[PDB]
Structure 1
C-alpha cells in the first residue's frame, strides 16, 4: 500500500474541476515512478495536454515530457510541505528526467490551486 496513491487519486478528482485551466498553463505530460525499496511500486501519469487533463496509472500512453522518480515517503513529504522538491533534487533524493524546466510549472500551478 502506497500513501502516494491517495494523492494521485485526489489530483484526478481535482482536475475534473480545475483541469481545463491547469492544462492551459502547463501543456505537458508528467510521469511518476514511486519507489518503495528503491523498487518501483507504482507508476502514474498526469496528462495535462488536452481538455480537463487526466490522471491514470501506468506509464504514459505516449511520450512523457518529464519523468520524476522518488520514494513514496519522499513524495509524501513534498506533498505535505516538509521537503522542498528542489532541495531534494540537488540532494539526489528526487530524480527528474526529460524536460526538467517543465517541472517548475507543475508545482507552482497546483499549489496555487491548493489555496482555493
Structure 2
C-alpha cells in the first residue's frame, strides 16, 4: 500500500511536534484504506495525550472520527491532486463520527508541512 510510507512519516514527525498537535486537535482518528473495496489497512492516529501516536489497527478506544477511502485517493489528497472536501462531497471520501474534527486535523497538519 503506497499510504503506509505516509503513516510512518506522520509517526516519525510526532516524535518532534507531537505535543503542540495534541494541544490543538485533542482527538483520535481511525483510517480504513481500501484496495478494490476490500480494506487493505487500518491505521489509528491518537492525538489525545502526550506526543500522540500512530499505530496499525483500530483505535485502542473510541475513535472520534473514522475516515474511509482507497489507498490511491489517500495518495492524491497527500500529493494535493485531490481536495479532500470535494472527495467527501463526491462520495470517494467517507467520514463517520465527529465530521468537523477532520477539517480541524487537515488544517493543523497542513501547517507543520510548511516547515
TM-score between the two structures when normalised by the length of structure 1: 0.98
Instruction: Name segments (4+ residues, structure 1) moved above 6 Å.
Output: none
Q: CA deviation at 1:9?
A: 0.1
Unaligned stretches of 5+ residues in structure 1: none
| Higher percent of residues as helix | 2
Q: CA deviation at 1:69?
A: 0.0
Unaligned stretches of 5+ residues in structure 2: none
Aligned length: 115
**Pairwise CA RMSD of aligned residues?**
0.3
Partner of 1:22: 21
Secondary structure of the corresponding residue to residue 112 of structure 2 = coil
After superposition, give the CA deviation of every residue in 1:55-111 in whole Å (9 maximum; x if it has no partner).
000000000000000000000000000100000000000000000010111111011
Partner of 2:41: 42
| Distance in 2, Cα, partners of 1:29 & 1:40 | 19
